[PDB]
């Protein structure tokens, strides 16, 4: 035609694709910076573990002193160890599980009391539990189990106030098929106790 903007527009068409392409890429490259970061941290976490080093477990066999303990090592020999500034002697006591630096054999921190694998299997059992409320019926019987068990666990405050001894122990017996298991499974949820 007569226009030189008609000649310009051909060229301007080529340009158009370029902006779009550059925008696609910019968005990808930022996402990539982030992706490599996570990978980098995690490789570095292995390395923090290699310089941190393992530790030895025993159990306090007997208290010798505030600042001396008889521990029985898992590896083998009974030891007298020191107490670190970091572990408080209020935590330390006889028969509690312990862990210690390998280096100086100095109690690092205490452990929670560990469990033998037999009793772990028992604890681990969970079916995702059930309601109160899907154990339905023999209403009055469910109510009384709650009275013995549940009522002093949540509120021992009422039992101490009155100055009565906490009520404890229940024995369940019935026919087969009556749901003692179904109820066992149920009471456990309601209160939330371990």
């Amino acid at each position: 035609e007569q226009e030189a903007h008609n000649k310009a527009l051909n060229q301007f068409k080529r340009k158009l694709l370029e902006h779009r392409r550059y925008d696609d890429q910019l968005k990808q490259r930022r996402q990539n910076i982030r992706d490599l970061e996570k990978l980098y941290d995690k490789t570095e976490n292995d390395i923090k573990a290699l310089q941190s080093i393992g530790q030895l477990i025993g159990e306090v066999m007997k208290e010798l002193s505030e600042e001396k303990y008889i521990v029985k090592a898992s590896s083998g020999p009974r030891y007298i160890v020191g107490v670190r500034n970091s572990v408080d002697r209020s935590k330390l006591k006889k028969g509690v599980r312990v862990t210690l630096d390998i280096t100086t054999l100095t109690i690092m921190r205490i452990l929670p009391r560990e469990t033998d694998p037999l009793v772990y299997n028992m604890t681990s059992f969970e079916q995702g539990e059930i309601t109160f409320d899907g154990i339905g019926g023999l209403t009055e019987q469910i109510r009384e189990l709650r009275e013995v068990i549940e009522l002093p666990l949540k509120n021992p405050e009422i039992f101490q106030r009155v100055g009565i001894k906490p009520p404890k122990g229940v024995l369940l017996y019935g026919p087969p098929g009556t749901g003692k298991t179904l109820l066992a499974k149920a009471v456990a949820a309601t209160i939330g106790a371990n």
Binding site: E44, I47, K48, Q51, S52
Partner: protein
């Protein structure tokens, strides 16, 4: 960020290292040995565990001119994490004994490798004091009283 530096425990490794390092650059006559200190930081107790030299120049004609090599600080970090990851940059020693105002500006630099305010550990290597072979100071920024400005 934290303003936690209330107690500064020094390993004796740091004071003898600063003694060597002054003499391995041969700074004298109010020229200084500026190096890094590593340890743990972001904490109530700082333990100053290690010290290293860095490349550094100190000009006596104007105190706002000194040299520092940034690339050295980045490369030394890579290495020290492999030996020990409990070691990280926590700030800088300065030979002293004279604290200056230009040192606040060196301070700003070191605030770009550590989250906490950098610790400036004055270690007198000339052994003029019979006590204080460590004095410790930390730069904090606060509005000073008596009609005074915000001072760093």
């Amino acid at each position: 960020m934290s303003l936690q530096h209330e107690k500064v425990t020094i390993a004796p490794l740091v004071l003898l290292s600063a003694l060597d390092h002054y003499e391995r650059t041969q700074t004298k006559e109010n020229k200084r040995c500026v190096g890094v200190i590593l340890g743990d930081a972001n904490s109530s107790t700082i333990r100053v565990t290690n010290s290293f030299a860095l490349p550094f120049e100190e000009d006596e004609k104007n105190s706002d001119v000194w040299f520092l090599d940034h690339n050295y600080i980045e490369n030394m970090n890579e290495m020290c994490k492999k030996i020990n990851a409990k070691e990280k940059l926590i700030g800088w020693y300065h030979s002293g004994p004279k604290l200056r105002a230009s040192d606040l500006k060196i301070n700003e630099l070191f605030k770009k490798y550590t989250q906490n305010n950098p610790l400036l550990l004055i270690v007198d290597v000339k052994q003029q004091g019979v006590g204080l072979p460590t004095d410790a100071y930390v730069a904090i920024e606060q509005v000073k009283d008596d009609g005074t400005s915000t001072e760093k």
